Amino acid sequence: SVKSEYAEAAAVGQEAVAVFNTMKAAFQNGDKEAVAQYLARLASLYTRHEELLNRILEKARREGNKEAVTLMNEFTATFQTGKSIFNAMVAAFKNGDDDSFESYLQALEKVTAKGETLADQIAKAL
């Protein structure tokens, strides 16, 4: 069901959460080769999560589930904020700008932490 597709998408997000916190440790420790690999792994996870979310939203639309569609539109918008912050973090790593990288990492944690009370609302709405 759309609900099980959501629990599958939620797990992928929690995989990115895990890798992100591991990546933050490697950055703090100066293990740039680890960071590079973790950033690639995060890109693939965010691309997978985004595709799953879009399928879930499209299903809710086709099912006429207006409340789920509303919540998924809000959640997908915030998801794209994170994607932009993430992509800015990746560019800062390429450029050797640790100041920006730190900044973007905190910003991404905050945008992520905020968009969680909604993530639980969507699980109940589908």
Side-chain angles (χ1 to χ4, degrees):
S1 69
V2 65
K3 198 171 292 184
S4 66
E5 281 140 27
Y6 191 68
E8 291 148 26
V12 178
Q14 288 308 105
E15 196 178 318
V17 160
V19 175
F20 182 87
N21 277 324
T22 300
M23 177 273 298
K24 179 180 171 182
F27 169 73
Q28 292 172 349
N29 293 335
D31 186 350
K32 307 191 62 168
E33 292 194 32
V35 174
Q37 285 176 258
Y38 294 135
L39 294 169
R41 191 74 167 182
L42 286 161
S44 177
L45 288 165
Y46 291 142
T47 299
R48 168 69 165 167
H49 202 183
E50 182 181 342
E51 205 249 315
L52 293 178
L53 294 165
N54 283 344
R55 284 154 43 177
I56 289 162
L57 170 57
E58 288 146 18
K59 194 157 182 175
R61 286 177 176 147
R62 286 191 308 270
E63 291 177 348
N65 184 337
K66 287 187 188 75
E67 186 53 31
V69 167
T70 298
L71 301 167
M72 280 297 296
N73 287 324
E74 293 172 335
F75 191 74
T76 50
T78 301
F79 178 90
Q80 289 297 326
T81 304
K83 184 185 181 183
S84 296
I85 292 176
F86 174 77
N87 287 334
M89 184 172 72
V90 173
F93 179 75
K94 178 181 184 190
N95 280 325
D97 178 0
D98 285 349
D99 178 68
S100 299
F101 192 94
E102 307 143 11
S103 171
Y104 287 132
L105 188 146
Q106 289 201 34
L108 177 53
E109 272 176 335
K110 291 170 191 176
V111 167
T112 296
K114 285 189 175 71
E116 282 324 300
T117 55
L118 180 59
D120 286 15
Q121 289 180 230
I122 293 165
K124 298 164 181 172
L126 291 168

